[PDB]
Design a protein around this nucleic acid. Structure first.
Ligand SMILES: Cn1c(=O)ccc2ccc(F)c(CCNC[C@H]3CN(c4cnc5c(n4)NC(=O)CO5)C(=O)O3)c21
Lengths: 722, 725
DNA sequence: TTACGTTGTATGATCATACAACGT
DNA sequence: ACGTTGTATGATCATACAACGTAA
């Protein structure tokens, strides 16, 4: 039993539901009104059928099963020949479910135009959130309706307990039946194109799901976001046009992917999943000095506390943060099979691996508790998570992330820590610093390989001025004992792949100067593959140039400095803009940290003053406590003391009545007064704060920095043979 | 995978390593000596190859990959020269790894006996424990001397720790190379079946790896357990070993681990270790019955990273089984999401799309956990503590029951009614010399979580509960409406869809031409409603029902094997009287421990209160001593004849407590604690008082958690109707 | 009369997609 | 044309082990 069939052929009311996965499929099949309804499970996502011919959809198995399970052949039939009466799209209310629904809708448009023109295609409106503040069960579908509860929430008892349905599997079968399956209360919407909106629907769908219209999708997203800035409805409708449903669903999915899935934040240089992973690891006490713990617990904590997504993506992000060959400055230190340079994805499983935070990760979490960043409730509302991290160094450039989203993408390469820190310090010293001065300090990307960067300085200047660009890297080809020994490989290049590519040269004998191909790599020499050419009359250097031109020993890397800025909007920024925005972020975080410490110092100083007042009149204070029935107001009135100070006096212990504790209090008061003076002076003068920032950056660079790994030297274009 | 072949054909020294999986495969491939060694991954276990013919081993991919990767066809001969000289087994030192090694050894002996006689079979001895103090690489596997190289760290920093390395994944590739792959430090052992002991080896292996002789292996296990007051000065280093020793020891270890830690429940809490770890981790997560639901992914991660060193899928399956009402008579887990269906129990969702919490019944296992009721043991990493047992207020081993299969033994404990078992326990406490028949007058028998009917006679049930082993039978519950048979209840673990398919198969084959309409009128209001409409009112529907019972799944049998781990720590088959008596002993022990814990707390607090009152009487002198003496504790002890803990309590008193209201509160606390101490000592001093308290507690638990019997017991005929010319 | 199918903790892996952007 | 980079949507397979009941 792969699908679910009914026990009736009456086309009047027979219904088929296309669900996301068998996790929801089980709930749908157990909650179904069989002989009336049917459920068809799909193995995950489907394929964009807009840019594929109607005769060529015979490769995927989900759509093949749909075609066998549906009367309509994939071509434009228009005949009735229908198995199930009503065809419904049952996709989860999350943005990813909306994307799957949009893909299914595109498939239903390019191949089943009759099923929409006749009016037999329906879309389910499943809820995503349930609010239970009492006997006031409330359901919502989107975050824009999960925030309208802040209106009728005029209660001070019975706190709301929001529950987010992770798709449909989280939903109980009876709840799913009542919301989206039982016709007496289900919110099914008939999707109609009609002659009035046929052209409009075709135009919008072509704009959305086209491989070449991505520019017009960027324009669409920009325009809608801009007019959303101005104005951030559901009228309980039984029918809707495709041009509205598909447009809204793809807008939601694109915005979610752009701002919550694939683009990093300028401050911490992390995508949301990475931030949640690091925060959950910190909350587990998995600091660099702690003992290793199973990655399974970390993944479970991330999924059950902050991230409502899959296991595999979280584990892949963890491995990427832990792999030295993927991250220039890894955030995770691991024990076990954490991948290999030739096969990065050959890592073990969360049951057979141990993980801990790296020392570098301290630069993202040292100031987390000192009111530095804003915090937001999690999906269930039972916890709080940091929206950002107090990055002491600009991790967006030191490590860099590569990601692809809807409309946009990003390919930020890593850079050297010390050089970027020096650039930031120079920018602080001279705010009106040109890009060229910074490029004289950073010189460009610093990949985690000992290979060479061959792109010219002028091209790098163009890339760092316009943002977009491409860099190129080569190999080290130094000769020892008359034999060529390759010691360093380009980034994301497998030695086995290079050997297999060279084997094409060996078999085709385009260059018959070779005499063997062996890999003598060992633990002492990480990569040692020896290629023995002819004698010393052939000038093998040009043959190496040809090999660079043909094989993967010289490769290019895209650069797209696209990120979410402090304004909350994606944008492409140059080196100067990135550094300025990160400096603003660091100044803000340092100000918040200083204010937090100042508040703590002032409160403790007030308490210490009250304690000293109590110590001066200890006998009278004890007499008042032992004689007066309400000693707190009496203490407040007699000594002109505050309620918090009176409570501190009342909470003093007998052991503190000794003179040594009084001396300790006096010393603490003196030190805290000096600290308060220093903090107030720093917060009052801009130059003092700039000096503090420069000192912190220099100290962090000296304590956590390292030398450049990939030297930058200009090289020729190579290329040969024709 | 792609067998990661080497770049050399020298048959003299080429080595192939069989690993347990690509998780360990990556580390092995990174730890390999290039063209000197090779690694072939295996997808878990393969098969017991002892009782399979030499022509039936070659298959699609399991044995075929090994045979191709080695060249030697399993023909007991043909020792050619194709791929690799030496064949090595790289299995983890854990009991499952020993099982894998035993299976591989069976495959290599029953079909490649020449490859062992000539000497080409080696076993790796990888370490399981790691001490990580310094920058001096340490590896060693052992259990008798949990010391050793540790002691050579009396000149560096750091305190002893423990790393269990899981099975192989936790090892770093370089660590794997140093331990079991690089010959300069590798500890490989050549497995040789000497010609002098071959007859003995075949005798042992036939005892071990036989589908039918495995049953009577309990005598081997029983003897080894009995001879526990003996132990091998260790096996030291031999550089070579006989299979008769290696296979016997490995299979003994694996069988003991499966019996006592994987498949048999403990008599006290009635739980297998994985279930206990799940429940404990849920309790430590605050997932009480009154708490909010949390994602099962977090629970599984906690179980795997804190207490259970095994796979996630098995843990999730056990959790789902504990949560399904149609699987557990008294479920321990309450869930939100797709937690399965009675017709498709394994159709549940995933731990990312489901929420879980402990059930109210689970309180009966954890309410007294925080006291001194149970023993605690360090976990695998040594950074936490785990309860060896749970303070079961009721005998969950009989109320819920578990079914499991292990090496040598198995167990099929059926569920029972809570109230009936509680009444039986109360009667046993009242009359210790109560016969089995008297208990059976209260306990009617098993109580499955279905409204179906139990048809086995009372005498047969008595025989089952007297001899332990037996079999029970259940028949569906059906009712006639409008002259048509309506089935309302189905037997346990029976899908309605399966019954409908079976009856439709009979209808299509026209075995029963008296039928006229087989319909499924099941709905949410009525869980099971299967309607059989016969062709008219002259058809003997009773005989057709008897035929269906004899032929379809409407009548099913259930094995009963009351095998469990007793308080002695040894598996045994126990009868109803033995189970009840042993659990009563366990409950008495736990209650005594709880009372002693509360008594100790009460006495310590009374001591502190006495010190506080003494301080209150002489507050001025105490304050003067504190303000004048640098070390006030000995001075207070000398002046007031007071204890060190009392002196510290006086020093930790707050100024707000110096008021008269706090003194009155302390005096009231003292009076209440004196009464509590008197009551606890009276209960602990008299057996009759403790027995009365136990009866009261059992009755209260039965009244708060009990329910009526779900499966009535009514005797029915043998059926066996129709199917004749 | 002899071969298959369960129950349940365990050993373990593999399959099809979206989405932007450039080099081959 | 294809093949990558990486967070995301959802699943699929081969076994051990005891003990009885179909069932062919
Ligand atoms: C994992 N595979 C393979 O290799 C090979 C083939 C294959 C075929 C179909 C499949 F469908 C799967 C996935 C199994 N089904 C996934 C479960 C596991 N899981 C989860 C979550 N969080 C965890 C954890 N497991 N494990 C821990 O230890 C703690 O964290 C879920 O939520 O769905 C497969």
């Amino acid at each position: 039993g792969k699908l679910a069939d009914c026990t009736a052929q009456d086309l009047n009311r027979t219904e088929l539901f296309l669900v996301e996965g068998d996790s929801a499929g089980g709930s749908a099949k157990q909650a179904r009104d069989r002989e009336y309804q049917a459920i068809m499970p799909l193995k995950g996502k489907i394929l964009n059928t807009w840019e594929v011919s109607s005769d060529e959809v015979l490769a995927s198995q989900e759509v093949h099963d749909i075609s066998v399970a549906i009367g309509i052949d994939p071509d434009s039939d228009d005949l009735s020949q229908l198995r199930y009466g009503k065809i419904c799209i049952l996709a989860d209310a999350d943005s990813d479910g909306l994307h799957i629904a949009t893909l299914l809708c595109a498939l239903f448009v390019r191949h089943f135009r009759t099923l929409v023109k006749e009016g037999h295609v329906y879309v389910a409106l499943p809820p995503l959130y349930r609010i239970d503040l009492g006997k006031e069960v409330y359901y919502a579908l989107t975050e824009e309706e999960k925030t309208g509860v802040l209106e009728q929430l005029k209660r001070k008892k019975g706190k709301p307990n929001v529950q987010r349905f992770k798709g449909l599997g989280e939903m109980n079968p009876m709840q799913l039946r009542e919301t989206t399956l039982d016709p007496n209360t289900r919110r099914l919407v008939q999707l109609v194109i009609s002659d009035e909106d046929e052209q409009q629907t075709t135009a919008i769908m072509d704009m959305l799901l086209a491989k070449k219209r991505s520019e017009d999708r960027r324009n669409w997203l920009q325009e809608k976001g801009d007019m959303a800035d101005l104005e951030v409805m559901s009228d309980m409708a039984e029918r809707l046009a495709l041009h509205e449903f598909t447009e809204n669903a793809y807008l939601n999915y694109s915005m979610y992917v752009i701002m919550d899935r694939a683009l990093p934040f300028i401050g911490d240089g992390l995508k949301p999943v990475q931030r949640r992973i690091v925060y959950a690891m910190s909350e587990l006490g998995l600091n660099a000095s702690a003992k290793f713990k199973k990655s399974a617990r970390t993944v479970g904590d991330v999924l059950g506390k902050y991230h409502p997504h899959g296991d595999s993506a979280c584990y892949e992000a963890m491995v990427l943060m832990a792999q030295p060959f993927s991250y220039r400055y890894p955030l995770v230190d691991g024990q076990g099979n954490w991948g290999a340079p030739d096969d990065p994805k050959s890592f073990a499983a969360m049951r057979y691996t141990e993980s801990r935070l790296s020392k570098y990760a301290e630069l993202l979490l040292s100031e987390l508790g000192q009111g530095t960043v804003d915090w937001v409730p999690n999906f269930d509302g039972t916890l709080q998570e940091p929206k950002m991290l107090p990055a002491r160094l600009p991790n967006i450039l030191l490590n860099g992330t590569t990601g692809i989203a809807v409309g946009m993408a990003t390919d930020i390469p890593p850079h050297n820590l010390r050089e970027v820190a020096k650039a930031a310090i120079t920018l602080i010293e001279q705010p009106k610093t040109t890009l060229d001065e910074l490029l004289d300090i950073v010189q460009g990307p610093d990949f985690p390989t000992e290979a060479e960067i061959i792109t010219s300085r002028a091209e790098i200047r163009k890339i760092y001025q316009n943002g977009r660009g491409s860099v190129r890297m080569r190999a080290v080809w130094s000769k020892e004992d008359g034999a060529v020994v390759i010691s360093a490989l380009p980034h994301q290049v497998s030695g086995a792949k290079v050997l297999e590519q060279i084997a094409a040269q060996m078999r085709n004998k385009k260059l018959p100067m070779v005499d063997d191909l062996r890999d003598e790599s060992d633990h002492e020499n990480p990569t040692r593959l020896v290629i023995v050419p002819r004698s010393n009359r052939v000038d093998m250097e040009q043959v190496m140039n040809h090999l660079f031109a043909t094989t993967d020993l010289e490769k290019s890397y895209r650069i797209n400095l696209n990120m979410i800025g402090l304004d909350g909007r994606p944008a492409v920024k140059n080196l100067l803009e990135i550094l300025s925005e990160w400096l603003v972020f660091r100044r803000d975080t340092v100000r918040r940290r200083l204010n937090h410490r100042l508040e703590k110092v002032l409160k403790r100083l007030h308490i210490l003053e009250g304690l000293l007042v109590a110590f001066l009149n200890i006998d009278e204070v004890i007499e008042i406590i032992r004689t007066e029935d309400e000693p707190k107001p009496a203490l407040m009135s007699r000594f002109g003391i505050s309620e918090t100070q009176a409570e501190a006096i009342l909470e003093l212990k007998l052991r503190h009545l000794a003179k040594l504790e009084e001396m300790k209090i006096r010393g603490e008061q003196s030190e805290l007064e000096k600290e308060r003076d220093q903090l107030q002076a720093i917060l009052a003068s801009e130059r003092k704060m700039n000096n503090l920032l420069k000192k912190e950056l220099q100290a962090d660079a000296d304590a956590f920095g390292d030398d450049r790994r990939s030297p930058l030297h200009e090289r020729e274009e190579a290329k040969a043979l024709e």
